[PDB]
Subunit: 95 residues, 2 copies
Amino acid sequence: PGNPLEAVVFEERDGNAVLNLLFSLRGTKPSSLSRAVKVFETFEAKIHHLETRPAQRPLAGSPHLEYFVRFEVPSGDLAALLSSVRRVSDDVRSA
Amino acid sequence: PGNPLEAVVFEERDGNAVLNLLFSLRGTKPSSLSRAVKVFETFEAKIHHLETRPAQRPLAGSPHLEYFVRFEVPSGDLAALLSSVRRVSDDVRSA
C-alpha cells in the first residue's frame, strides 16, 4: 500500500536530500542493519549520524528494537539507494 | 606486530565483555563498516552504542574518517567475533 500522509518523508539541501530513517527487527539473527549502511554508502552519500541500539537493554517493557540514522544523498540518488533500504525494511518510518 | 601497551583493550561485566572500537577508511567505496555490525550481531552480543559518522563533513582540515561503537559479548565469544572485526580492520584501536 501507499500512505501519502505517512511519516516517511525527506528534504533537500544544496541540491541533495537530508533525512533520517528508523527500522527495527525481532529475533537475534535478523539484524542485517549492516546492509542498510551499504545503502547510504553505495551512492557516496554524506551520513550525518548513523546509529544502532536495540531497546530492552536500557529499558524493557515499553520500548522495542530500534536504529536511528541521518544521512544526505543527491535528491536523485536518494531514491536510488533508498530503494535498497526498502529492500531491507518496509514496515518502518523516517526519524 | 603485537603491541602490549597498545590502546586496544576491553573489560568484562557480569560474565561478558563490554568495550568500544573505532575504525576509519579512506576512499568512497571501501566503507564496509556494515560487516563490522555483523560481528557484534553474529554472536548475539549486546550493543550499547553503535555509531558511524565520517569526519570532514562537520570539520575538515584537522579530523578524519571515524566510526564509534560500544558493545558487549561473552568474555569468550568476544575474541570470537572480534577476530572478524580484525578481518575488517587492523590499523585502528578501541574507543
